[PDB]
Design a binder for this molecule. Sequence first.
Ligand code: UDP
Ligand code: UDP
Ligand code: NAG
Ligand code: NAG
Lengths: 511, 511
Amino acid sequence: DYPKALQILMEGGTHMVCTGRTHTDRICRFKWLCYSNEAEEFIFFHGNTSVMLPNLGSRRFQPALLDLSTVEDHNTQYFNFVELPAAALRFMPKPVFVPDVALIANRFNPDNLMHVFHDDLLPLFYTLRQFPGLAHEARLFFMEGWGEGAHFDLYKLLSPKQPLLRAQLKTLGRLLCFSHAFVGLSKITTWYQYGFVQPQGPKANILVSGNEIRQFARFMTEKLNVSGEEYILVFSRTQNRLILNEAELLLALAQEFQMKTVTVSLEDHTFADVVRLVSNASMLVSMHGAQLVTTLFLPRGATVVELFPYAVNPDHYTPYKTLAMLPGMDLQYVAWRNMMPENTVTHPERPWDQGGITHLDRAEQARILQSREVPRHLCCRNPEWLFRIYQDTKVDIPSLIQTIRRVVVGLYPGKVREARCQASVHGASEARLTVSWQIPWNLKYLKVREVKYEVWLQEQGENTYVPYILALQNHTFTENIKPFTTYLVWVRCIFNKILLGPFADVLVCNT
Amino acid sequence: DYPKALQILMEGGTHMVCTGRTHTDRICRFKWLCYSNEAEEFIFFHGNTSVMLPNLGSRRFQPALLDLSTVEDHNTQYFNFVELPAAALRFMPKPVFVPDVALIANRFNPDNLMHVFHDDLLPLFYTLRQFPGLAHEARLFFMEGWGEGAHFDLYKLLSPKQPLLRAQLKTLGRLLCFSHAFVGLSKITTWYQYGFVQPQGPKANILVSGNEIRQFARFMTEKLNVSGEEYILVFSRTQNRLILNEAELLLALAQEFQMKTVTVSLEDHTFADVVRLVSNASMLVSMHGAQLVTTLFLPRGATVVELFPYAVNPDHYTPYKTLAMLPGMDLQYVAWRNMMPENTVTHPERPWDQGGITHLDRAEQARILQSREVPRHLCCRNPEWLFRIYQDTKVDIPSLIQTIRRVVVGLYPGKVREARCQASVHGASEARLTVSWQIPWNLKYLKVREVKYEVWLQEQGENTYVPYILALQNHTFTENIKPFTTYLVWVRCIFNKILLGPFADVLVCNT
Ligand SMILES: O=c1ccn([C@@H]2O[C@H](COP(=O)(O)OP(=O)(O)O)[C@@H](O)[C@H]2O)c(=O)[nH]1
Ligand SMILES: O=c1ccn([C@@H]2O[C@H](COP(=O)(O)OP(=O)(O)O)[C@@H](O)[C@H]2O)c(=O)[nH]1
Ligand SMILES: *[C@@H]1O[C@H](CO)[C@@H](O)[C@H](O)[C@H]1NC(C)=O
Ligand SMILES: *[C@@H]1O[C@H](CO)[C@@H](O)[C@H](O)[C@H]1NC(C)=O
């Protein structure tokens, strides 16, 4: 309803309510957020019912309101708006309204399958499902400035409505206003950082586990219409980073591990067929590369074998190691390296970004050629890294087989209950303290190999009294227990040495 | 549909997706979260589609998953669940399902009007509106263990469905399971902390402003059905903390400020009539106390006059000062203190919690009686604080009038645009650097008293080169500009000295 819509906007203005503490995981819900196609700016209109929560003042630019993309590149990462009085619409073209609920987001690299899944698809899947209804109603708006890219078919599976690119918005009018828009992508599913500040590596406190990956994987499998069976799957590339003796590799793996081997590639199968093959594979063998993000479709119990060309240290490039080894993935991971320069083929004459080093270096071409290992570096330009990563590789088959052969629950306790303490007296003036409790309520439903309890004693005033680990639900303390004194006592239960349960309410004990 | 519901739960288990980084502002969306009325515990069932995002491991108990209440009391603050295998339902009573979408939350003190509005109503209003549909569909479940309390009529205005208390859940069955539940209250509207760790005071970085308070205020006014006119409103108490010369106070204020004065109290008017009176008042006069949270209903331009009894320092008790002075509230705030012991009446013989000090103190009753000012203290027991705060007060009218008489926008710039730099040469070998830019896009729509620009220069390598504040959009740097050198240049625009806009993309300049 155009007149009512324009009136609500011109008089009331924009409304914004956001989750989160800082820009790193603020997600915002907007009503009447506008966008100028000429200025390429989002606009917050101040009207007489406008709401801006949080109201950050100058901190809104330190560095930005929120993160549009999960990749912390300090560039396409950031979202902000500019402020105008709602009354300024009197001097502006009449706006075009977007009635769909929108999710606005930026893609870091839509042409790379790892970036697509890890930076965009998994975050979109769970960001959408944070908010009721978005998953079945939202239209994605990708604002970063890229076109469709090689995997647009995959982005389409995430929104029910056809996504729109920034270029297509210029055709809709000079001033667009969103009646209902969400802005921001959660980083909660991320596990890797690409090396902008320190060398690339896993993130420090990963909050995603196998069950969360698998729920996403099942969703993609159904949207791809692909929901005896022991085989090894070799995920080849056809353009660069080749396995030069692939046919001999396939035969040796089949004979050694005694099961059929099959090849797959992105270039010669539909993605649905890729997912179909990965999803029932017992082993996935592949050169390091973006196709290994399909590891997230493997069945429980499978093995990932990642091959690295000459001079490339597997411990420096662990996005698929990190994924394969997440808690609950139930995969095994094997890295194998080519250490034999006779088994590598370099390509020093290719375009600089496909590995070439003739592009322009003096005696630097000679440092690279003679370096036995690519040193730690930062994103994203390093010449030596691209030179070595785009080598082709002849796999030393006995070394690979021996390497593979060498390299082959979790519920936490509740609080203990009804904890109590009793002081007692013995000898002449000697004090004792007995502490007892009942097992956690959930323990009767579990089958746990080792159950222990940890008791912390503190004389009211100073530090703690060395925790005591016990198997029983009662213990009498004698040493360092003095009469006429108050002790605070805490108890927690521990499953299998490492699953630390919560502490109960502190007990105050008087001797 | 009971069999389908039970099957989805027993096979798939619980799903959880949460916003936020830490327990302080994590809000969680659950499907199939259950609750045992006997154990008084929430239950996460692990099934073969269970999702727990974030998966915190042991950090889920450091200290808790999320905060059920906005008051950081380390007690009713915390929410957690205990984990069970979904298969354990074979050995459990059949669950009762809750079909309504639920918002689960804890109230810190439902009997105190300040705690009700600041801890519960405002956070509920915006937490509900973070998520589409909750505002018109959710049923509140208050789990803290209190009954209805004196302001239950107000909590009812926030959910469209009748809220439920924990006591009423025990009557519904042994095991309840929520098909759709949100858990957590945002702290984003809070402005005060009640002194559990350091003495009570405003919070350090308040993110709520007048427009956000007012949107909430308008909503309450409509749900209360209450949406010439210059008058002063005296908000009296009838039970304790009395103004002993109220009638003389009313007459003196009316004659001095030349407008009608009116009284109001919680005890003798309906809350809707209270809101009706506060909402058009030009001045609100009241003893310090919970009734002053109605400050948030005042019209723009009004004045709050808060009276403090003998020995109570206004600077130590600022919840209504802080509220009145929030950016965008457009209120004035006056605190007045009784410094005259002849004008105070103490009540040393009342119950300890209504001010009494005979309850039990030796020569401590004498320290309190002779102390000229209540010292800084922590929540919530302090004897001297309760003794002084429950005094009655005769107001010294000339002192109050003189005190009142003595004590009587904000849009930020966009980025500058098209910033460029040119190196130039002068004398023999002397280098100059000229920098220019266009004004921010939003500036043409504003009326700003002072517009300046701040330019930061850095010789690539060391720190910055003292920012230069300029009024023009171009400037030539001469001193400390060396040839054969690279300078990074940043520019931001500043409105009225304190509204700092964002920096544009850095300029790289070569001399
Ligand atoms: O022979 C090739 C080389 C690349 N790619 C795909 O093209 C994209 C870009 O490859 P690039 O080498 O840049 O990334 P990488 O594999 O190093 O992550 C990725 O999605 C690869 O899976 C492919 O399908 N075949
Ligand atoms: O004479 C009185 C005293 C208190 N109250 C209300 O009773 C509650 C508890 O008052 P208390 O003194 O405990 O809190 P305070 O006013 O100090 O915040 C608050 O909502 C007060 O507004 C009231 O209506 N009349
Ligand atoms: C804003 O203006 C419109 C009409 O101009 C009016 O309906 C609405 O109540 C106004 N709100 C305020 C807070 O002034
Ligand atoms: C879980 O079990 C049910 C039936 O027992 C089945 O429909 C569903 O596909 C199972 N999911 C997995 C991941 O095993």
